[PDB]
Every structure is written in C-alpha cells, then in structure tokens.
Design a protein around this ligand. Structure first.
Ligand SMILES: CCCCN(CC1CC1)c1nc(C)nc2c(-c3c(OC)cc(Br)cc3OC)c(C)nn12
Ligand SMILES: CCCCCCCC/C=C/CCCCCCCC(=O)O
Ligand SMILES: CCCCCCCC/C=C/CCCCCCCC(=O)O
Ligand SMILES: CCCCCCCC/C=C/CCCCCCCC(=O)O
Ligand SMILES: CCCCCCCC/C=C\CCCCCCCC(=O)O
Ligand SMILES: CCCCCCCC/C=C\CCCCCCCC(=O)O
Lengths: 160, 263
C-alpha cells in the first residue's frame, strides 16, 4: 500500500532522468549521483540493482530502490526529537502519511508543524487536520495535502 | 401413434428443465441481493477490495435480472419478428455477460497486485476495465450483427458466421490471462511467501483455495455447451437436467464465493 501511495502522489519513472538541478535520478525520485558523467550514474545504478547493466529498470526494480529510501527516511525520523515520539505513537497507516510528508519536504520541513504534531500525538485528529490546512504547504499542492490529511483524520487508505 | 407419446414425454422433461431454470434464477437473484446490501452496509465498503466485490455482485444482479426479460423474447412470434426492443434486450444481456468475465478478471488482477506491491482513486482502473472496456466490444458486435446477421433478435445460431467471436474472443483471452496470474500467485505463495503472514497473505491463500473450488464448478457449465448429448433417453434427460441446475445456480455460487472472501 505505501508504494502505491507514493507512486500516486509523486510519480514513477522507469528510465534514468535528470532532475530540476541536473542530477541523475530514477524510480520514485531516487537520486543516483551528483556526478555529471552518466558513467558514474549507470555504474552506481548496477552496483545498486546488481542486475545486467542497463538504464531501464523493472517495476520490481523501482520498489526495491523505493524500499531503500523508505528505510533511510525512517532512520532520519527516529533521529529527530520532535518526530520520533509522534511516529512511535501512530498506527501503520498514519505512519505512512508521516513518511509521505518527509519525502516531499524533508525531516526538518515536517518538524516545523509543531501544533499539528502535538494534536497527532494526542490522537486528537480532527483538530490536527485544521492546523495542517492553514499552511503554505496545503496552498501549494492542495490535492496531495488533502489526501495525506484525510489519511491522518481517519487512519484508512480510503482516499488513495 | 407411439411417436406422439414419445413426443409428449419429452415435453414433460423440457417443461421440468424450464422449472429448474426459473427456480434457480429466483434463488440466485435473492442471494445476490442479500449479499449486495450486506456489502453496502459495512464501513469496509471503502476498502478497494470491497469496492471490487460489490461491483462484481452488481454485474451479476443485472445479468440475472435481465435473464427474466430474455425469457419474454424466446416466444417464436417475437423471435422471428426481430423487433427493435428484441435486439436491445439481447445486446444488454450479452454486455452484462461480458462484464461478468471482466470483473472476475478484475478480481484476479487485484489479487496478483496485492501480493507484489505494497483506495477511491485506484478503483477507477477497475471500474474502467469491468464496466468500460466491454461497452465498445458490444457496440462492435452490434455493428456486426447489423450488416451480416440481422435476424432472430441477434440470438440466432447460424453456421459459418463468426460475428459472436467479436465478444467471445475477448472473454477467452481474459480467462487465459487469469490462468497465468493463478500460476504465478501459486508460484509466489509457495516459494518466496511460504513462511509469510502479512494480512494480505492469509487472505490471499483463502482466495486461491476458494478460486480452486469455484473454478471447476463454473468450468463444467461452459464445456458442456460444446457436448452433443446423444439420443439415449437416459443420456438426454440427464444432460438437460444437470445443465439446467448448473447454469441456473451460478449466481448463487458466486454470492457464496464473494461473502466468503469478506471474512
Ligand atoms: C461467471 C462468468 C465467467 C466466470 N469465469 C468462467 C469460469 C468457467 C471458468 C471466469 N472468468 C475469468 C476471466 N476468471 C475466472 C476465475 C478466476 C481465475 O481463473 C483462472 C483465476 C483467478 Br487468479 C481468479 C479467478 O476468479 C476470481 C474463475 C474461478 N472463474 N473465472
Ligand atoms: C431483500 C430480499 C427480498 C427481495 C425481494 C425481491 C425478489 C426479486 C424476485 C424477482 C423474480 C422475478 C419473477 C420471476 C418469476 C417466474 C415465475 C414463473 O414465470 O413461473
Ligand atoms: C400495441 C402493442 C404492440 C406490441 C408491443 C409489445 C412489446 C411491448 C414492449 C415491451 C418491452 C418494453 C421495453 C423493454 C426494454 C428493456 C431494455 C433493457 O432492459 O435492456
Ligand atoms: C451500475 C453501472 C451500470 C453501467 C451500465 C451502463 C451500460 C448499460 C448498457 C446496456 C446496453 C448495452 C448494449 C448497447 C448496444 C447499443 C447498440 C444497440 O443495441 O442498438
Ligand atoms: C498505457 C495503458 C493504458 C490502458 C488503458 C486501458 C483502457 C483503454 C480503453 C478504455 C476505453 C473504455 C471506454 O472509454 O469506454
Ligand atoms: C458450492 C459453492 C462453493 C463456492 C466456493 C466456496 C469456497 C470455500 O468453501 O472456501
């Protein structure tokens, strides 16, 4: 379910591409190398994919990269003293919504939602939802934000 | 003489088959209605997989309700008249028949995806495959019936025309793909997930077992439509009664299947 959640509100690419800043990337936003040479880009790739060298990957391949990035993200969540305790207190669905926010704005971006985070840890989900919505975030990607917020409010996958 | 009394006897056994066929369809339709409202009541109606079940049930309700209307076109006067409402009834019935195959394929696609990839948005894909793709297929078939076989309320059997392959070929093809799905699900369940107990694994072995039970029940029905029964009195009567019981309780079996996977 979490793979389909992020596929939905971020997208999925199967051949290596350069991002807005010019680095080599693939899958659901997995950066491969800031090295400008494609040599290092495809090299680091097969070292990761450990498959027959190529620039196209498997839908299967994307999910294995995606799972690496989910790990790195949870590692960063537990290292952050404003995020650790909220995460530890949440069910599996609501944890997924928190990982979603971290993919979009990073750990320090999410730590800034201090009121909302205390709502969530107080399992007080109605009024958390109104806080999350008075923000520049909600205003800039309002479809993604509504889906993530509804997932906090209900604890179900119903919105995806 | 003795021919006529042999003709009257058959009328009895045909009239008995007809009674089995009306009875089964009434029982099936009530069973699907009961199963439908049960699904609609649960809060679990918002999970993707229960959206799929309820649309599957709906598709079978429409086909089984339409069967009754079809019976009113099997009148010889109506059948030969090829009146307009008569062809529209036949097309609606075949459309619903195609949606029954495509929603079962929808079930197979979801089960294969649920064990390989970790709801209201994703549903539109299944709605599009189950209700959507059959619509142009039936239109295509109706254009065919118009220019090459415009008779008998489009429910004729005429040797040499293959106009019905236009909608029967797609049916066999999605069945063929569901067979590939099933081998890989079994393959995956028995190698990689042999020791697993994710929630979607338990519920997946339940599906595979139920699918293996249902598949022969429903399969006999479709293979018998190819047998020539034979002229033995015992052979005919049994062929006619076994077929009428299996065809007419199909809706019943499916409602049992669907409710089982609710657990
Ligand atoms: C009722 C109108 C058509 C029903 N029907 C024909 C029956 C005679 C064989 C059917 N059509 C189609 C496309 N798939 C199926 C399945 C099926 C499956 O079959 C290999 C594999 C998987 Br994985 C899931 C499956 O269903 C959840 C079953 C049990 N029946 N079935
Ligand atoms: C919630 C359960 C209650 C549902 C009640 C609705 C029942 C729907 C039944 C429809 C049957 C259609 C009529 C078939 C009668 C055939 C009899 C005959 O022709 O001899
Ligand atoms: C003046 C009487 C002429 C005889 C008319 C007899 C036919 C009357 C019509 C019967 C069926 C009415 C329309 C049914 C269409 C249903 C379409 C559908 O359910 O798919
Ligand atoms: C609950 C959603 C149900 C969706 C139903 C929508 C489509 C129903 C269609 C019924 C009839 C299909 C046959 C159309 C053939 C058109 C050509 C013709 O008959 O002249
Ligand atoms: C890339 C793969 C996209 C596949 C799309 C499958 C559906 C295409 C046909 C949908 C038409 C149904 C309709 O419009 O009635
Ligand atoms: C007889 C109807 C059987 C329908 C399949 C039931 C599957 C099961 O018992 O697990």
């Amino acid at each position: 379910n979490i793979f389909e959640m992020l596929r939905i509100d971020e997208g999925l690419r199967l051949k290596i591409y350069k991002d807005t800043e010019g680095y080599y990337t693939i899958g659901i936003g997995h950066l491969l190398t800031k090295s400008p040479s494609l040599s290092v880009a495809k090299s680091e790739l097969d070292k990761a994919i450990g498959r027959n060298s190529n620039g196209v990957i498997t839908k299967d391949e994307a999910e294995k990269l995606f799972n690496q990035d989910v790990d790195a993200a949870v590692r960063g969540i537990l290292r952050n003293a404003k995020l650790k305790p909220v995460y530890d207190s949440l069910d599996a669905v609501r944890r997924s919504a928190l990982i979603n926010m971290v993919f979009q704005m990073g750990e320090t971006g999410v730590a800034g939602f201090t009121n909302s985070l205390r709502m969530l840890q107080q399992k007080r989900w109605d009024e958390a939802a109104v806080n999350l919505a008075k923000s520049r975030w909600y205003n800039q990607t309002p479809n993604r934000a509504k889906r993530v917020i509804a997932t906090f409010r209900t604890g179900t996958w119903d919105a995806y | 003489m003795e021919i006529l009394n042999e003709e009257k006897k058959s009328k009895v056994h045909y009239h008995v088959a007809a009674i089995i066929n009306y009875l089964g369809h009434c029982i099936s339709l009530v069973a699907l209605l009961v199963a439908f409202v049960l699904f609609l009541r649960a809060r679990s109606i918002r999970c993707l997989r229960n959206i799929i079940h309820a649309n599957l049930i709906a598709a079978f309700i429409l086909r089984n309700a339409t069967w009754f209307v079809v019976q009113l076109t099997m009148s010889p006067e109506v059948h030969q008249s090829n009146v307009g409402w008569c062809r529209l009834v036949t097309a609606a019935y075949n459309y619903f028949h195609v949606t029954n195959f495509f929603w079962m394929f929808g079930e197979g696609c979801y089960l294969h995806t649920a064990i390989v990839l970790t709801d209201r948005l994703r549903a539109w894909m299944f709605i599009c495959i189950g209700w959507g793709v059959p619509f142009p297929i039936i239109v295509a078939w109706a254009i065919g019936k118009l220019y090459y076989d415009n008779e008998k309320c489009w429910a004729g059997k005429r040797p040499g025309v293959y106009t019905d392959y236009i909608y029967q070929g797609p049916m066999a093809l999605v069945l063929l793909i569901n067979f590939i799905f099933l081998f890989n699900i079994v393959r995956i369940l028995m190698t990689k997930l042999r020791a697993s107990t994710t929630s979607e694994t338990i519920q997946a072995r339940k599906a595979v077992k139920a699918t293996l039970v249902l598949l022969p029940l429903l399969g006999i029905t479709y293979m018998l439509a190819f047998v020539n029964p034979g002229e033995d009195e015992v052979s005919r009567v049994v062929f006619i009664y076994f077929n009428a019981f299996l065809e007419s309780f199909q809706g019943f079996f499916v409602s049992v299947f669907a409710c089982f996977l609710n657990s």
